[PDB]
Design a protein around this ligand. Structure first.
Ligand SMILES: [Mg+2]
Ligand SMILES: [Mg+2]
Ligand SMILES: [Mg+2]
Ligand SMILES: [Mg+2]
Ligand SMILES: [Mg+2]
Ligand SMILES: [Mg+2]
Ligand SMILES: [Mg+2]
Ligand SMILES: [Mg+2]
Ligand SMILES: [Mg+2]
Ligand SMILES: [Mg+2]
Ligand SMILES: [Mg+2]
Ligand SMILES: [Mg+2]
Ligand SMILES: [Mg+2]
Ligand SMILES: [Mg+2]
Ligand SMILES: [Mg+2]
Ligand SMILES: [Mg+2]
Ligand SMILES: [Mg+2]
Ligand SMILES: [Mg+2]
Ligand SMILES: [Mg+2]
Ligand SMILES: [Mg+2]
Ligand SMILES: [Mg+2]
Ligand SMILES: [Mg+2]
Ligand SMILES: [Mg+2]
Ligand SMILES: [Mg+2]
Ligand SMILES: [Mg+2]
Ligand SMILES: [Mg+2]
Ligand SMILES: [Mg+2]
Ligand SMILES: [Mg+2]
Ligand SMILES: [Mg+2]
Ligand SMILES: [Mg+2]
Ligand SMILES: [Mg+2]
Ligand SMILES: [Mg+2]
Ligand SMILES: [Mg+2]
Ligand SMILES: [Mg+2]
Ligand SMILES: [Mg+2]
Ligand SMILES: [Mg+2]
Ligand SMILES: [Mg+2]
Ligand SMILES: [Mg+2]
Ligand SMILES: [Mg+2]
Ligand SMILES: [Mg+2]
Ligand SMILES: [Mg+2]
Ligand SMILES: [Mg+2]
Ligand SMILES: [Mg+2]
Ligand SMILES: [Mg+2]
Ligand SMILES: [Mg+2]
Ligand SMILES: [Mg+2]
Ligand SMILES: [Mg+2]
Ligand SMILES: [Mg+2]
Ligand SMILES: [Mg+2]
Ligand SMILES: [Mg+2]
Ligand SMILES: [Mg+2]
Ligand SMILES: [Mg+2]
Ligand SMILES: [Mg+2]
Ligand SMILES: [Mg+2]
Ligand SMILES: [Mg+2]
Ligand SMILES: [Mg+2]
Ligand SMILES: [Mg+2]
Ligand SMILES: [Mg+2]
Ligand SMILES: [Mg+2]
Ligand SMILES: [Mg+2]
Ligand SMILES: [Mg+2]
Ligand SMILES: [Mg+2]
Ligand SMILES: [Mg+2]
Ligand SMILES: [Mg+2]
Ligand SMILES: [Mg+2]
Ligand SMILES: [Mg+2]
Ligand SMILES: [Mg+2]
Ligand SMILES: [Mg+2]
Ligand SMILES: [Mg+2]
Ligand SMILES: [Mg+2]
Ligand SMILES: [Mg+2]
Ligand SMILES: [Mg+2]
Ligand SMILES: [Mg+2]
Ligand SMILES: [Mg+2]
Ligand SMILES: [Mg+2]
Ligand SMILES: [Mg+2]
Ligand SMILES: [Mg+2]
Ligand SMILES: [Mg+2]
Ligand SMILES: [Mg+2]
Ligand SMILES: [Mg+2]
Ligand SMILES: [Mg+2]
Ligand SMILES: [Mg+2]
Ligand SMILES: [Mg+2]
Ligand SMILES: [Mg+2]
Ligand SMILES: [Mg+2]
Ligand SMILES: [Mg+2]
Ligand SMILES: [Mg+2]
Ligand SMILES: [Mg+2]
Ligand SMILES: [Mg+2]
Ligand SMILES: [Mg+2]
Ligand SMILES: [Mg+2]
Ligand SMILES: [Mg+2]
Ligand SMILES: [Mg+2]
Ligand SMILES: [Mg+2]
Ligand SMILES: [Mg+2]
Ligand SMILES: [Mg+2]
Ligand SMILES: [Mg+2]
Ligand SMILES: [Mg+2]
Ligand SMILES: [Mg+2]
Ligand SMILES: [Mg+2]
Ligand SMILES: [Mg+2]
Ligand SMILES: [Mg+2]
Ligand SMILES: [Mg+2]
Ligand SMILES: [Mg+2]
Ligand SMILES: [Mg+2]
Ligand SMILES: [Mg+2]
Ligand SMILES: [Mg+2]
Ligand SMILES: [Mg+2]
Ligand SMILES: [Mg+2]
Ligand SMILES: [Mg+2]
Ligand SMILES: [Mg+2]
Ligand SMILES: [Mg+2]
Ligand SMILES: [Mg+2]
Ligand SMILES: [Mg+2]
Ligand SMILES: [Mg+2]
Ligand SMILES: [Mg+2]
Ligand SMILES: [Mg+2]
Ligand SMILES: [Mg+2]
Ligand SMILES: [Mg+2]
Ligand SMILES: [Mg+2]
Ligand SMILES: [Mg+2]
Ligand SMILES: [Mg+2]
Ligand SMILES: [Mg+2]
Ligand SMILES: [Mg+2]
Ligand SMILES: [Mg+2]
Ligand SMILES: [Mg+2]
Ligand SMILES: [Mg+2]
Ligand SMILES: [Mg+2]
Ligand SMILES: [Mg+2]
Ligand SMILES: [Mg+2]
Ligand SMILES: [Mg+2]
Ligand SMILES: [Mg+2]
Ligand SMILES: [Mg+2]
Ligand SMILES: [Mg+2]
Ligand SMILES: [Mg+2]
Ligand SMILES: [Mg+2]
Ligand SMILES: [Mg+2]
Ligand SMILES: [Mg+2]
Ligand SMILES: [Mg+2]
Ligand SMILES: [Mg+2]
Ligand SMILES: [Mg+2]
Ligand SMILES: [Mg+2]
Ligand SMILES: [Mg+2]
Ligand SMILES: [Mg+2]
Ligand SMILES: [Mg+2]
Ligand SMILES: [Mg+2]
Ligand SMILES: [Mg+2]
Ligand SMILES: [Mg+2]
Ligand SMILES: [Mg+2]
Ligand SMILES: [Mg+2]
Ligand SMILES: [Mg+2]
Ligand SMILES: [Mg+2]
Ligand SMILES: [Mg+2]
Ligand SMILES: [Mg+2]
Ligand SMILES: [Mg+2]
Ligand SMILES: [Mg+2]
Ligand SMILES: [Mg+2]
Ligand SMILES: [Mg+2]
Ligand SMILES: [Mg+2]
Ligand SMILES: [Mg+2]
Ligand SMILES: [Mg+2]
Ligand SMILES: [Mg+2]
Ligand SMILES: [Mg+2]
Ligand SMILES: [Mg+2]
Ligand SMILES: [Mg+2]
Ligand SMILES: [Mg+2]
Ligand SMILES: [Mg+2]
Ligand SMILES: [Mg+2]
Ligand SMILES: [Mg+2]
Ligand SMILES: [Mg+2]
Ligand SMILES: [Mg+2]
Ligand SMILES: [Mg+2]
Ligand SMILES: [Mg+2]
Ligand SMILES: [Mg+2]
Ligand SMILES: [Mg+2]
Ligand SMILES: [Mg+2]
Ligand SMILES: [Mg+2]
Ligand SMILES: [Mg+2]
Lengths: 99, 82, 96, 7, 122
RNA sequence: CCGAGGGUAGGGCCCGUGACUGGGGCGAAGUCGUAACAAGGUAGCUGUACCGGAAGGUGCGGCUGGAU
RNA sequence: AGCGCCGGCCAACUCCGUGCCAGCAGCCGCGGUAAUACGGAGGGCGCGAGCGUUACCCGGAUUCACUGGGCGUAAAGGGCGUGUAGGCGGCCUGGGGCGUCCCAUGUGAAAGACCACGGCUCAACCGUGGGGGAGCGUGGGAUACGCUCAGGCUAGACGG
RNA sequence: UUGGAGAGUUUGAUCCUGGCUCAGGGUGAACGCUGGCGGCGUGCCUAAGACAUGCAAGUCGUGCGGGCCGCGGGUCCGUGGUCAGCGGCGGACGGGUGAGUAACGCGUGGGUGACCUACCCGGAAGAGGGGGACAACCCGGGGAAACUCGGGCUAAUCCCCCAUGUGGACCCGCCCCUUGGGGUGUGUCCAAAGGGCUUUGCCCGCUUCCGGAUGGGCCCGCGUCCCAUCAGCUAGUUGGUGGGGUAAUGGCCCACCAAGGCGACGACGGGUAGCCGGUCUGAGAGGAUGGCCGGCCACAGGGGCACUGAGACACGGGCCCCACUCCUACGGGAGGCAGCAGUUAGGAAUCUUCCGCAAUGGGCGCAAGCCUGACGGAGCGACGCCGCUUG
RNA sequence: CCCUCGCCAAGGAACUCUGCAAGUUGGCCCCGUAACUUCGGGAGAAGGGGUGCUCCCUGGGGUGAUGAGCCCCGGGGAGCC
């Protein structure tokens, strides 16, 4: 089955493309604790109907471009800009990490 | 073509073949597709030959080709009995 | 120091020229037809386009073109001719 | 490596 | 017409690239060296890990010149550079290859090895 | 058009090596003094600063891991 | 029939030679004129067409500690706040089912390993059969705990 | 529940902490002293340094025409060979190596409505008429050679046109489906090749199409070392449109437009490394390792390139550049052991220029058969394990 | 012969106290630019590419009117010697 993921939209700034931020949980193989890990997927939005804060599902599909390998499958939630802020604050904290 | 042949196992001076289906371009003792029986040419045990016969006919039906000395060990196991 | 590789090399050259000549014509008549399709020149375009199509599939008989290559090249040829003639007049003859 | 060089 | 201070390309694989003539080995006071004349040279540019290195004082034979050399038959020949081949005290080349054409004047002057290794003898 | 690579010019990283120079470690029986361990004969340690052949000394502040 | 070894660890001791020499040595250490520790000899211990040595890997090493360690003085608490990400988070009710748990099912090649039997006189080697997991795909189920969503509380916290 | 031992050494002595050290098992080993036999294994870990000589891929006369040669005669056929040529198929397998690669490379599970598959199998349909070229051969220069140029003849399963259209391909319609999947209608386009016998028929072959099977390509999730004393990286970069290209998706490639893409969940950079089944150790958890065997990847003196083709950007095929070596009659030409042996260099160190296609397997062939350094065996070496002797 | 000037084969500082003198370089546009630094600089570092003419398409400005004309700053494409 084509893999189906769920994540928010952290970028709408491309033509016919949105960035979907999927996260997953798993126990540490050695230290057992359940840890979080996230990953951005460049998803296909050909109708340009999806926007920031939208929690959506993406489906594995044939390549639209380089790097673009998933299609947005369906909306799930909307207006989750609270998650988008978490992403942006982190990327923002990187300026305080240089030298 | 897909074939049906003998993949010599055993040890030096101790031949022990597996009648097996594999690609003709695969190496002799290489990764086969399915095992359809074994064959001890030296006859050192009561049952030195054994063929599934049901499976040996499936691959035969779909286009597998036996070897010349593999065709015999399927004949001698009555794979061709009409 | 020898081989039948020498022979297989001689043959490769003969078929190289045989393949190149066919693809040259396939490119020539296709552009020729597409050029008329832009002018349209509707009848003359389609009359050429057939000779293109004929030579294309005539290549997929041997080792010059793969079937899906001929199909792909035919698909884009007729696809381009119609859209050019739609900026002009009736197709008149055939191939559509 | 012209032509003389600097190094 | 090579003289002290003249730079020359080395037409061999000795590792040298450019040598500067410091002497024309031709009698007491030869003003110039042409094709077939031996020179003494400093090695001004070499590639790493060669038979010769920068700063070596080597001997070489001029194998072609930008000054045209004249021939008894009324013809002349000229090259686009001054090239030489690094040799030893027995006039033998110190490398295994020579690059580019050389002037046939080398043959009559006693450099049979170089002439053979030459891709063209003009 | 692209193109192996060759060439010109200028950067970055790494390795080797260098007159000389800096301390470091180690080395049975060298020279100088005796700073520390006892209140070690000026309680010690301390951050800093300055000085002195050398340990060290002294100033300012801190600590007791200081005797009585 | 050879090779190592016989101070302790570590199984195997006496004589002579040597006198901080010559030498031994994996660690602790032996040798300065009575050395089971150096060298030879006799004897003794251990292996045996091998026996030792060097190099390297895991073990002992719970000495990178998930199983399974610590930080007053042994090495180890940041000079002290404030706070970003993150990690973690009180009592009750319900929705979902992500973690988590269960069942079924697909995959998990052969070889190898393991058990059984058998073939080379045994064995090594080799043949035949048996037993499977974890992980991931799918389908079904459970909802205590963790998660999320929704609603309520006042014991934490903040305020008057 | 088949599984867990510890000791020496800091002190006058003690407890603790803590490092060092030892007893165990392991090896593609090497070195010393020593050495009898057999079996099964196993053996360049360094210079992916350099290589003398033979060999490692050919086959089909049941596709074609010849030169030669013997066999039965009339220089006519047939015939046997034999040699190249044309034409098939194979040479993309198998064999070697571990340099590169920290990557969708590998592993594991998946996607392909985005795809291909020679020979094999199964079902459907068909093979009807014409024409043509190039080698071999004949003639002429050149060369030490490698060797090639020119002109002229000719056959075929070699090339081309026409016809036939079960079918298939393409554009545009509508239908079902739902990413390019399966239909259908008009127009348009595409097939073929013959040979051998025992001859109102078989056999090997040919042609278009559908399906199977097998082998592949491509894509995605998760996993996959060290350094943060590498903290910022990015212009085809990230997305879009159009187009090219391919079997096929894609910035894979080009034009243009947009300003995006990635990074402390470690981007970028540096170092090291082929990955896995497994192997070694360990009570396990873990650690270490990936030689031999099996799977995948990568490379073929160093690079770039395409051709032929079902399939290669091809180890023993081709082109070009570079480095090196070579023969030469000095005018000019050749080579690529990380195939099997073998040489040399390096190193502490690693084998026979052996036998055979009898077996298994592979290529070709109607078959006989031919080729097969794959393979099966023999050889050297206490390298290892096992068995045996010196009573 | 002197002055001022032009050119020169091969070499290219060998001249000489000294590259003295004379060559070289040279405007503009674009790319690009190191040590070090007092963070301004070093910098025109260095180094490189472009530069004419013709045709075609096109962006903005001043004037005027918002248009033509005139004037200013540009962009892309194809060519010619
Ligand atoms: Mg044997
Ligand atoms: Mg294969
Ligand atoms: Mg043309
Ligand atoms: Mg085709
Ligand atoms: Mg050179
Ligand atoms: Mg050098
Ligand atoms: Mg120098
Ligand atoms: Mg030379
Ligand atoms: Mg040259
Ligand atoms: Mg010559
Ligand atoms: Mg270029
Ligand atoms: Mg380039
Ligand atoms: Mg370059
Ligand atoms: Mg070049
Ligand atoms: Mg540099
Ligand atoms: Mg010093
Ligand atoms: Mg004294
Ligand atoms: Mg004192
Ligand atoms: Mg005092
Ligand atoms: Mg005092
Ligand atoms: Mg004092
Ligand atoms: Mg003080
Ligand atoms: Mg004082
Ligand atoms: Mg004080
Ligand atoms: Mg204080
Ligand atoms: Mg006090
Ligand atoms: Mg012992
Ligand atoms: Mg004792
Ligand atoms: Mg012991
Ligand atoms: Mg004892
Ligand atoms: Mg004495
Ligand atoms: Mg003595
Ligand atoms: Mg001792
Ligand atoms: Mg030891
Ligand atoms: Mg005595
Ligand atoms: Mg004594
Ligand atoms: Mg004593
Ligand atoms: Mg003793
Ligand atoms: Mg001892
Ligand atoms: Mg003794
Ligand atoms: Mg033994
Ligand atoms: Mg040993
Ligand atoms: Mg143990
Ligand atoms: Mg451990
Ligand atoms: Mg250890
Ligand atoms: Mg440690
Ligand atoms: Mg430690
Ligand atoms: Mg713990
Ligand atoms: Mg501890
Ligand atoms: Mg504190
Ligand atoms: Mg601080
Ligand atoms: Mg927080
Ligand atoms: Mg939480
Ligand atoms: Mg809770
Ligand atoms: Mg769940
Ligand atoms: Mg298995
Ligand atoms: Mg069992
Ligand atoms: Mg298991
Ligand atoms: Mg599962
Ligand atoms: Mg489910
Ligand atoms: Mg123990
Ligand atoms: Mg102890
Ligand atoms: Mg001690
Ligand atoms: Mg102490
Ligand atoms: Mg003591
Ligand atoms: Mg005490
Ligand atoms: Mg005492
Ligand atoms: Mg103790
Ligand atoms: Mg300890
Ligand atoms: Mg201890
Ligand atoms: Mg050991
Ligand atoms: Mg030995
Ligand atoms: Mg063996
Ligand atoms: Mg053996
Ligand atoms: Mg070697
Ligand atoms: Mg190894
Ligand atoms: Mg190697
Ligand atoms: Mg070397
Ligand atoms: Mg060499
Ligand atoms: Mg042979
Ligand atoms: Mg034919
Ligand atoms: Mg022939
Ligand atoms: Mg292979
Ligand atoms: Mg092998
Ligand atoms: Mg080998
Ligand atoms: Mg191998
Ligand atoms: Mg590798
Ligand atoms: Mg890297
Ligand atoms: Mg990295
Ligand atoms: Mg990956
Ligand atoms: Mg994968
Ligand atoms: Mg996979
Ligand atoms: Mg083929
Ligand atoms: Mg066939
Ligand atoms: Mg004909
Ligand atoms: Mg004809
Ligand atoms: Mg001809
Ligand atoms: Mg010639
Ligand atoms: Mg001739
Ligand atoms: Mg001709
Ligand atoms: Mg219809
Ligand atoms: Mg037709
Ligand atoms: Mg026909
Ligand atoms: Mg992929
Ligand atoms: Mg990954
Ligand atoms: Mg597109
Ligand atoms: Mg790209
Ligand atoms: Mg572009
Ligand atoms: Mg742009
Ligand atoms: Mg991440
Ligand atoms: Mg590297
Ligand atoms: Mg390595
Ligand atoms: Mg590597
Ligand atoms: Mg352990
Ligand atoms: Mg075990
Ligand atoms: Mg590993
Ligand atoms: Mg391997
Ligand atoms: Mg081997
Ligand atoms: Mg392997
Ligand atoms: Mg390469
Ligand atoms: Mg090599
Ligand atoms: Mg090459
Ligand atoms: Mg290469
Ligand atoms: Mg082709
Ligand atoms: Mg390749
Ligand atoms: Mg090949
Ligand atoms: Mg190639
Ligand atoms: Mg080769
Ligand atoms: Mg050539
Ligand atoms: Mg000649
Ligand atoms: Mg030549
Ligand atoms: Mg020539
Ligand atoms: Mg030539
Ligand atoms: Mg060549
Ligand atoms: Mg070649
Ligand atoms: Mg070899
Ligand atoms: Mg060898
Ligand atoms: Mg050697
Ligand atoms: Mg050596
Ligand atoms: Mg061997
Ligand atoms: Mg055979
Ligand atoms: Mg086989
Ligand atoms: Mg066979
Ligand atoms: Mg056959
Ligand atoms: Mg042969
Ligand atoms: Mg042989
Ligand atoms: Mg063998
Ligand atoms: Mg050996
Ligand atoms: Mg043995
Ligand atoms: Mg003039
Ligand atoms: Mg001049
Ligand atoms: Mg000049
Ligand atoms: Mg100069
Ligand atoms: Mg110059
Ligand atoms: Mg000067
Ligand atoms: Mg003068
Ligand atoms: Mg002078
Ligand atoms: Mg001077
Ligand atoms: Mg002056
Ligand atoms: Mg001046
Ligand atoms: Mg000037
Ligand atoms: Mg000027
Ligand atoms: Mg000037
Ligand atoms: Mg600089
Ligand atoms: Mg400077
Ligand atoms: Mg600055
Ligand atoms: Mg600046
Ligand atoms: Mg300066
Ligand atoms: Mg400036
Ligand atoms: Mg400039
Ligand atoms: Mg500037
Ligand atoms: Mg310029
Ligand atoms: Mg003009
Ligand atoms: Mg304008
Ligand atoms: Mg205007
Ligand atoms: Mg005005
Ligand atoms: Mg106005
Ligand atoms: Mg105006």
């Amino acid at each position: 089955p084509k893999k189906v993921l769920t994540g928010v939209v952290v970028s709408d700034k491309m033509q016919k493309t949105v960035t979907v931020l999927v996260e997953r949980q798993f126990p540490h193989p050695l230290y057992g604790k359940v840890i979080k890990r996230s990953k951005k997927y460049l998803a296909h939005d050909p109708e340009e109907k999806y926007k920031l804060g939208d929690v959506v599902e993406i489906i594995e599909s044939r390549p639209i471009s380089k790097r673009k390998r998933f299609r947005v499958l369906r909306l799930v939630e909307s207006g989750r800009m609270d998650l988008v802020e978490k992403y942006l604050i982190r990327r923002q904290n990187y300026e305080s990490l240089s030298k | 073509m897909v074939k049906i042949r003998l993949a010599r196992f055993g040890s030096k001076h101790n031949p022990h073949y597996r009648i097996v289906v594999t690609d003709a371009r695969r190496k002799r003792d290489g990764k086969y597709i399915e095992k359809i029986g074994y064959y001890d040419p030296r006859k050192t045990t009561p049952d030195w030959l054994k063929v599934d016969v049901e499976r040996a006919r499936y691959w035969l039906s779909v286009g597998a080709q036996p070897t010349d000395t593999a065709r015999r060990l399927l004949r001698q196991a009555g794979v061709f009995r009409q | 120091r020898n081989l039948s590789a020498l022979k297989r090399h001689r043959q490769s050259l003969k078929r190289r020229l045989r393949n190149k000549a066919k693809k040259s014509a396939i490119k020539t008549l296709s552009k020729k037809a597409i050029q008329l399709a832009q002018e349209g020149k509707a009848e003359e375009a389609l009359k050429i386009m057939r000779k293109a199509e004929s030579l294309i599939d005539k290549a997929a008989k041997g080792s010059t073109l793969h079937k899906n290559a001929a199909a792909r090249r035919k698909s884009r040829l007729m696809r381009k001719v119609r859209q050019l003639l739609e900026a002009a007049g009736a197709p008149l003859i055939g191939g559509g | 490596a012209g032509x003389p060089h600097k190094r | 017409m090579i003289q002290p201070q003249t730079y020359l390309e080395v037409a061999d694989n000795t590792g040298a690239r450019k040598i500067m003539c410091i002497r024309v080995l031709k009698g007491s006071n030869a003003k110039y060296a042409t094709v077939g004349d031996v020179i003494v040279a400093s090695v001004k540019e070499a590639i790493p890990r060669g038979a010769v290195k920068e700063g070596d004082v080597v001997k070489a034979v001029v194998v072609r010149t930008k000054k045209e050399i004249k021939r008894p038959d009324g013809s002349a020949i000229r090259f686009d550079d001054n090239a030489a081949v690094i040799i030893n005290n027995q006039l033998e080349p110190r490398g295994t290859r020579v690059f580019g054409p050389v002037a046939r004047e080398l043959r009559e002057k006693g450099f049979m090895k170089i002439v053979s290794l030459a891709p063209e003898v003009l």
